[PDB]
Amino acid sequence: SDFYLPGDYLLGGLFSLHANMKNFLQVPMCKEYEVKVIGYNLMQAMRFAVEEINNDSSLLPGVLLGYEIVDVCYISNNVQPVLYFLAHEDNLLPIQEDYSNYISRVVAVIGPDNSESVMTVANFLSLFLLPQITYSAISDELRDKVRFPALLRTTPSADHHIEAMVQLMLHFRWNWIIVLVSSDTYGRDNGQLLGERVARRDICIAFQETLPTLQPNQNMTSEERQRLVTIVDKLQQSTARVVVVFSPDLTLYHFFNEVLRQNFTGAVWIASESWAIDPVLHNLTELRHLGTFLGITIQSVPIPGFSEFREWGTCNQECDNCLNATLSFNTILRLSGERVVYSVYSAVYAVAHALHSLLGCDKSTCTKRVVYPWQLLEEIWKVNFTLLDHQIFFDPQGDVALHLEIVQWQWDRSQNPFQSVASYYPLQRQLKNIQDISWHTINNTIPMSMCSKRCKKPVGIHVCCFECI
Amino acid sequence: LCLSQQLRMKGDYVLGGLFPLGEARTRPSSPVCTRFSSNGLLWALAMKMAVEEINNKSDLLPGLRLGYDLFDTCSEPVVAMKPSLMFLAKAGSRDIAAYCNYTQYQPRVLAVIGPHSSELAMVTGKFFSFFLMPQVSYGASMELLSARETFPSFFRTVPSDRVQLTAAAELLQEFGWNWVAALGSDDEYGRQGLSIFSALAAARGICIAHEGLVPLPKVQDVLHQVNQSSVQVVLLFASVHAAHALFNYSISSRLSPKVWVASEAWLTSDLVMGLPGMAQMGTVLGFLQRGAQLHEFPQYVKTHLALATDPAFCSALQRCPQCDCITLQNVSAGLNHHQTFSVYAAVYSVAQALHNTLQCNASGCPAQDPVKPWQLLENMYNLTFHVGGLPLRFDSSGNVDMEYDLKLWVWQGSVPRLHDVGRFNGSLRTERLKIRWHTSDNQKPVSRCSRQCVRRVKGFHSCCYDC
Ligand SMILES: *[C@@H]1O[C@H](CO)[C@@H](O)[C@H](O)[C@H]1NC(C)=O
Numbered sequence: 032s033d034f035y036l037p038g039d040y041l042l043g044g045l046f047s048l049h050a051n052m053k054n055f056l057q058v059p060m061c062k063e064y065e066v067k068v069i070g071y072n073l074m075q076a077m078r079f080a081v082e083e084i085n086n087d088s089s090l091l092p093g094v095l096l097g098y099e100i101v102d103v104c105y106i107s108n109n110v111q112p113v114l115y116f117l118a119h120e121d122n123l124l125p126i127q128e129d130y131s132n133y134i135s136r137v138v139a140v141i142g143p144d145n146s147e148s149v150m151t152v153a154n155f156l157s158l159f160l161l162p163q164i165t166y167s168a169i170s171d172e173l174r175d176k177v178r179f180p181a182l183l184r185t186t187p188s189a190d191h192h193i194e195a196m197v198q199l200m201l202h203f204r205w206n207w208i209i210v211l212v213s214s215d216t217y218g219r220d221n222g223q224l225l226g227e228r229v230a231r232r233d234i235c236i237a238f239q240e241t242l243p244t245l246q247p248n249q250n251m252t253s254e255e256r257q258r259l260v261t262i263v264d265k266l267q268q269s270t271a272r273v274v275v276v277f278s279p280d281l282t283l284y285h286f287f288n289e290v291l292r293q294n295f296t297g298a299v300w301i302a303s304e305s306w307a308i309d310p311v312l313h314n315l316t317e318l319r320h321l322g323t324f325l326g327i328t329i330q331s332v333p334i335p336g337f338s339e340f341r342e343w344g345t346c347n348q349e350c351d352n353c354l355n356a357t358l359s360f361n362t363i364l365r366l367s368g369e370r371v372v373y374s375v376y377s378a379v380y381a382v383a384h385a386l387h388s389l390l391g392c393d394k395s396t397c398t399k400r401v402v403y404p405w406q407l408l409e410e411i412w413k414v415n416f417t418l419l420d421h422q423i424f425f426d427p428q429g430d431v432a433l434h435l436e437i438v439q440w441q442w443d444r445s446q447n448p449f450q451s452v453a454s455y456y457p458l459q460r461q462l463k464n465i466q467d468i469s470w471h472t473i474n475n476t477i478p479m480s481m482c483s484k485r486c487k488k489p490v491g492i493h494v495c496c497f498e499c500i
Numbered sequence: 501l502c503l504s505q506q507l508r509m510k511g512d513y514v515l516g517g518l519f520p521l522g523e524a525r526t527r528p529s530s531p532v533c534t535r536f537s538s539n540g541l542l543w544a545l546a547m548k549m550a551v552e553e554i555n556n557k558s559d560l561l562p563g564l565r566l567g568y569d570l571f572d573t574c575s576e577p578v579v580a581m582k583p584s585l586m587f588l589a590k591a592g593s594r595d596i597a598a599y600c601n602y603t604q605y606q607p608r609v610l611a612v613i614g615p616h617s618s619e620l621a622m623v624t625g626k627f628f629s630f631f632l633m634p635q636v637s638y639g640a641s642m643e644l645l646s647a648r649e650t651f652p653s654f655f656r657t658v659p660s661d662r663v664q665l666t667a668a669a670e671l672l673q674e675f676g677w678n679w680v681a682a683l684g685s686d687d688e689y690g691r692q693g694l695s696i697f698s699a700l701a702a703a704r705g706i707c708i709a710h711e712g713l714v715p716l717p718k719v720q721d722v723l724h725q726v727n728q729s730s731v732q733v734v735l736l737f738a739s740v741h742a743a744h745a746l747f748n749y750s751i752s753s754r755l756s757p758k759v760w761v762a763s764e765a766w767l768t769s770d771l772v773m774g775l776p777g778m779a780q781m782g783t784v785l786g787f788l789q790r791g792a793q794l795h796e797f798p799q800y801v802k803t804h805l806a807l808a809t810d811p812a813f814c815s816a817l818q819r820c821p822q823c824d825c826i827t828l829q830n831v832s833a834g835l836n837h838h839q840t841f842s843v844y845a846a847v848y849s850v851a852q853a854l855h856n857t858l859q860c861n862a863s864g865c866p867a868q869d870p871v872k873p874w875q876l877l878e879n880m881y882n883l884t885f886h887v888g889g890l891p892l893r894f895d896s897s898g899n900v901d902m903e904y905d906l907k908l909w910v911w912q913g914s915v916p917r918l919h920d921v922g923r924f925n926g927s928l929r930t931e932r933l934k935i936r937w938h939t940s941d942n943q944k945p946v947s948r949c950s951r952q953c954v955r956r957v958k959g960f961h962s963c964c965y966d967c
Pocket residue numbers: 056057058600601603
């Protein structure tokens with residue numbers, strides 16, 4: 032199968048291959064959930080990276096890099112995987128005071144795509160100091176290394192996402208916005224971070240509301256119907272026309288259906304990293320009348336031959352509907368480029384480079400020595416190399432400075448669905464290279480979202496609001 | 501003193517234990533905590549007393565010995581993660597297999613008495629969820645631990661934060677304060693309290709004028725924003741240190757008196773009451789736990805500490821190396837602690853669940869194979885167990901149900917005394933004719949907004965209107 036490749040040194044992987052689309056004695060396996068195409072694309076990216084590494088005779092020569100990809104659920108199953116990774120070849124995990132001489136089944140694990148699952152896995156792995164590079168995880172709590180000694184990353188934290196959002200707001204002069212968060216911890220944390228960041232940059236939030244937890248493809252009670260109509264009515268009543276949404280892509284279906292039903296138009300929606308590059312949400316094509324959609328993503332890096340590789344191709348380690356589900360998504364995924372695929376690619380290559388440096392081989396046979404995970408983690412901090420004309424090195428707080436990009440949703444099946452309109456550089460914390468953006472206004476006039484026209488006594492709590500005298 | 505030798509006792513169905521016995525790496529080595537914590541040792545002694553008394557009983561678990569394996573956990577999760585792995589290893593073996601599901605496991609401990617810390621309880625509960633090991637925790641009162649989706653085998657003996665936040669919301673609604681400000685600590689506790697109270701208020705009509713966080717020892721900006729709205733009722737769901745820092749700053753800044761709603765964290769803390777000038781900051785109205793206490797715990801602990809010094813008993817008979825070089829005066833201060841009853845009741849609840857699972861009767865227990873830990877979950881939900889003559893029950897969501905007392909700080913000679921003015925039991929009842937308010941006369945402070953009216957929407961949630 033494609034979940035297992037034998038090799039001298041294994042490489043664990045945790046990918047969200049399924050999502051809860053709708054008795055504790057029986058455990059619901061991740062197999063029966065609906066297929067998530069993004070997780071399968073990321074798994075294909077990691078497999079392609081491993082195969083490319085094995086192809087080259089200049090990187091890890093004479094040593095076959097294997098991997099053991101397992102399917103982690105969003106939240107459901109995240110203990111068994113790590114137990115399987117840490118056990119020996121006999122599925123037995125010894126317990127001892129010291130783990131220095133202990134060798135596990137895998138030498139490094141490409142972490143999950145969820146902040147909470149990454150936190151749980153890192154808390155489990157802190158004992159063994161197993162190297163773990165996560166992708167598409169933005170929780171700020173993962174930056175400190177006191178409680179996550181063996182955690183790395185290949186994407187900037189939430190601070191850079193919020194900074195890019197605030198810079199975009201400042202460039203187009205919006206000082207009156209509405210923030211919508213989800214009931215889960217990610218949405219609340221991101222909303223609080225945005226509020227703290229924006230309270231000191233002379234931009235005032237009109238109000239903040241929480242969208243109820245709402246998996247699609249399910250029957251929703253009248254209470255949450257009332258909550259949704261109340262939220263949308265408050266949205267339409269307010270004069271702010273810039274809405275920033277911090278919610279997983281699963282929840283927003285019911286909210287967007289509700290606002291479409293309410294016929295509210297003329298707002299600039301700013302998307303978080305979670306649903307900025309959702310193809311299964313962008314395919315709706317009925318949101319074109321809701322205004323302009325923007326989002327904060329990782330720069331698209333064109334990986335040569337990845338699309339061709341994707342097209343040519345124990346328990347909780349097999350999925351059947353993935354290929355058929357992603358077949359219908361081949362065109363849009365090919366056109367949209369690689370944003371988190373590059374993150375997984377770079378994580379796998381960083382692990383390979385760390386292993387190559389640790390083994391100490393130079394374009395010839397390696398020393399084929401025994402490697403302990405803590406040694407690999409120690410050697411993985413100093414990796415520095417050029418990869419697809421990009422520099423990959425880790426900050427002291429375990430982050431990789433990969434440039435962000437503000438992307439705009441356009442609905443043209445013959446062109447790129449997510450068109451880059453701005454570039455954000457985390458190192459200098461500056462947003463530049465802004466290009467032409469197709470607005471929803473009559474002559475492309477930039478949308479006006481200010482709570483008071485420029486004139487002076489203040490009215491209300493917010494400084495941004497006043498009345499001309 | 502041979503005190504640490506009592507941390508393990510053999511029996512038919514041994515028990516687990518995670519206690520804060522001690523307090524505080526480029527190699528994968530477990531950290532070692534050498535400093536001694538009195539609260540952890542006292543809680544360990546409380547659970548030991550519970551187990552010993554239960555084994556003394558003939559009606560409960562007849563003919564069977566109940567063991568325990570106490571384990572030292574610091575505030576860190578790394579130190580406490582190993583003991584869980586030891587807990588779920590097979591009996592007689594130090595290796596834990598990586599099976600597909602829970603049904604193939606044979607843990608050596610029937611249950612686990614979870615950690616006191618909330619974040620450590622989160623980690624341990626998430627770990628125990630996979631194996632469906634029934635873990636009951638004391639003092640871990642966060643609300644997200646009640647989600648049965650991710651904690652199918654986590655219980656508790658202390659009320660959750662949701663109960664006290666619902667009591668606070670009902671207090672605001674009954675008194676007519678529908679225009680309030682909500683604050684909380686920058687840590688997990690305050691953030692979760694704010695997240696719960698936002699939904700509770702939105703459901704109950706009250707809405708938040710300003711929702712902010714007070715950083716742990718910025719605060720100037722937080723109270724300035726609180727001033728910017730004319731709100732006379734502020735809910736402070738903060739820990740001891742953050743609340744104390746905010747109160748000290750407001751004492752230095754001479755902020756106007758307001759009706760502060762107090763969480764259980766700083767309502768009873770002497771650090772905040774003893775702050776000079778606190779009497780000039782309005783009434784403090786909080787909800788306090790109404791729970792019993794172990795009457796015989798101090799006698800048991802003093803007689804056991806006296807008995808442990810005798811060499812004969814020790815010869816007749818490490819996890820906590822610093823638990824041996826200790827005097828009674830190092831634990832005498834915290835003898836009258838509430839959490840001891842929580843630990844005792846948790847142990848009693850686990851024993852009662854085991855007794856029900858085996859279908860034992862008064863004379864004895866029927867012969868059968870050992871009961872797996874996951875079999876306890878069926879008889880542990882919706883379970884009524886008696887602890888010291890007072891019945892207790894586990895909700896369908898795994899929380900105990902107990903009452904609350906609405907207390908206010910009554911000032912007399914700059915010595916604040918807590919006074920009972922109300923009682924929350926799911927439906928708040930208050931006696932407002934006795935409450936002594938801080939205004940110029942004895943009139944209830946007014947903090948209400950107009951939701952109907954020219955209208956200018958105001959509030960953090962766009963609720964009210966400025967007619
Ligand atoms: C546990 O996994 C085993 C694997 O052999 C399977 O037979 C059994 O049905 C599973 N039990 C569950 C999912 O409750």
